[PDB]
Amino acid sequence: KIEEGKLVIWINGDKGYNGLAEVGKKFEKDTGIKVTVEHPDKLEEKFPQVAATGDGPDIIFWAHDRFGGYAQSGLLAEITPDKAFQDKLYPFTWDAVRYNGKLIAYPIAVEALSLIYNKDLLPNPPKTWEEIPALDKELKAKGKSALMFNLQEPYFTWPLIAADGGYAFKYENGKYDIKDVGVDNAGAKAGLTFLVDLIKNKHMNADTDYSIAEAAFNKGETAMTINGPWAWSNIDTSKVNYGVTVLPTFKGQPSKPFVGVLSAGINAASPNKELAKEFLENYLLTDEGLEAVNKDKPLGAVALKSYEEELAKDPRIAATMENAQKGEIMPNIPQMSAFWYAVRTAVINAASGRQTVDEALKDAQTNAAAEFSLQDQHCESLSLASNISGLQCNASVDLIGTCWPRSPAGQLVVRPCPAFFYGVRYNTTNNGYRECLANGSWAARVNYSECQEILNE
Numbered sequence: 256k257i258e259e260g261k262l263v264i265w266i267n268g269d270k271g272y273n274g275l276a277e278v279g280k281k282f283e284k285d286t287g288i289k290v291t292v293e294h295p296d297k298l299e300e301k302f303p304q305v306a307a308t309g310d311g312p313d314i315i316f317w318a319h320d321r322f323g324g325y326a327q328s329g330l331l332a333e334i335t336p337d338k339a340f341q342d343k344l345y346p347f348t349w350d351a352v353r354y355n356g357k358l359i360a361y362p363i364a365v366e367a368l369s370l371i372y373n374k375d376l377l378p379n380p381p382k383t384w385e386e387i388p389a390l391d392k393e394l395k396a397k398g399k400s401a402l403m404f405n406l407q408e409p410y411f412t413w414p415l416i417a418a419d420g421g422y423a424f425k426y427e428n429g430k431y432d433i434k435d436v437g438v439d440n441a442g443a444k445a446g447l448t449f450l451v452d453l454i455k456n457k458h459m460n461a462d463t464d465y466s467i468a469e470a471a472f473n474k475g476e477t478a479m480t481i482n483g484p485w486a487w488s489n490i491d492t493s494k495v496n497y498g499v500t501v502l503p504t505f506k507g508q509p510s511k512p513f514v515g516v517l518s519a520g521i522n523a524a525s526p527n528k529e530l531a532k533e534f535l536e537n538y539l540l541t542d543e544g545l546e547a548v549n550k551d552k553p554l555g556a557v558a559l560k561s562y563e564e565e566l567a568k569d570p571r572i573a574a575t576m577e578n579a580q581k582g583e584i585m586p587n588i589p590q591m592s593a594f595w596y597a598v599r600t601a602v603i604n605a606a607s608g609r610q611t612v613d614e615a616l617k618d619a620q621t622n623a624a625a626e627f628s629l630q631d632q633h634c635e636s637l638s639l640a641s642n643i644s645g646l647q648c649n650a651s652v653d654l655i656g657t658c659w660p661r662s663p664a665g666q667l668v669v670r671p672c673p674a675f676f677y678g679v680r681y682n683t684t685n686n687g688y689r690e691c692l693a694n695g696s697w698a699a700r701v702n703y704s705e706c707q708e709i710l711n712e
């Protein structure tokens with residue numbers, strides 16, 4: 256458990272943490288409270304793993320789209336800023352952090368991906384995606400490359416996939432339809448087909464991650480990169496003469512990046528709740544506070560009206576806003592992470608040719624919509640027919656495909672042993688045993704010691 260009398264904050268390592276550290280350093284010699292800022296790898300997934308065990312940081316910075324999930328697991332306190340404080344920020348940023356009626360975080364900044372290009376290597380930037388393959392074949396000559404960006408994270412490839420009709424969840428009569436998923440329609444299919452083709456013809460390498468693309472652009476090896484306002488800082492230091500511009504169109508349609516609002520949540524387990532509120536409202540979300548972070552790594556447009564009034568003239572902020580305009584603010588519904596993971600997997604499996612586009616994307620449809628396997632359905636039909644009173648274990652299938660049907664609590668359940676002729680599973684004459692516990696959980700212990708064939712296999 257986190258201790259009382261300090262503040263532990265987590266932010267992504269691509270953001271201006273050292274800028275945030277100074278705000279906490281100003282906070283420290285003002286109230287007398289130690290603020291230590293960290294930036295763990297895989298933060299957005301690490302937070303729920305530590306939190307639910309009452310162990311996270313006090314405050315957490317991530318784009319708003321993950322917050323609905325956190326809120327549903329009960330990891331976030333609901334924030335209580337007065338009407339005076341709410342007026343200091345843009346209404347739409349508040350919408351982004353509003354979940355099931357309640358405000359669940361403080362909005363900080365509006366992020367959108369932009370096309371970044373090298374002016375010395377590329378006077379005029381391409382307007383269409385279709386002309387980049389033609390462009391890279393010219394840059395073959397001078398040992399340079401047209402375009403590299405993070406192909407590991409579907410945030411970067413989504414703008415292309417969304418362009419021609421692909422979407423996450425259908426919005427419908429003031430709500431998202433979590434079963435209606437635009438991940439393998441004609442539009443999404445086209446977009447990825449096009450991406451996959453850039454790698455086949457060797458215009459990009461499927462193993463290109465964030466820091467590979469970053470290093471390539473900033474040293475002058477590549478002509479373009481796709482990135483957000485945080486990236487700018489290092490590019491300045493590099494002294495590369497760069498432009499920030501509207502993302503290329505695909506099939507005459509604009510790229511549609513998913514816009515994120517950087518946001519700060521309060522750990523529901525954290526005792527230091529008022530102290531956390533004290534920090535964000537009075538120290539971070541201020542001209543000074545936000546300026547300090549922005550200097551370190553640019554935030555984009557900021558949620559605080561007053562300080563946004565300052566940054567507005569920056570042509571690069573304009574470009575961010577032009578792209579954000581073409582795209583959309585992400586939903587914050589708890590299914591967003593199932594969506595992201597689906598697309599993350601689709602893109603990588605296709606990127607490496609483990610799957611075709613259509614296989615990769617039909618899988619993504621499955622994944623994103625939280626749909627039931629055939630195996631799931633088969634197993635659930637095993638008890639539906641006969642009725643039990645009281646606590647029950649839900650049907651589930653274990654990692655060797657044994658179906659443990661819905662069963663009464665506190666009972667031993669007997670199922671046929673698995674065996675496999677090559678890929679073909681079948682059931683033997685022997686049995687495996689598993690207890691359904693008094694509390695409706697399946698026991699971790701599964702006795703397979705009589706399963707003669709599988710032991711031999």
Ligand SMILES: OC[C@H]1O[C@H](O[C@H]2[C@H](O)[C@@H](O)[C@@H](O)O[C@@H]2CO)[C@H](O)[C@@H](O)[C@@H]1O
Pocket residue numbers: 267269299317318319320321366408409410411515595
């Ligand atoms: O790649 C999917 C990923 O995209 C977004 O994460 C962004 C984040 O919002 C940006 O601020 C920046 O740090 O880059 C991240 C991409 O690595 C979503 O916010 C996130 O939920 C999603 O998984």
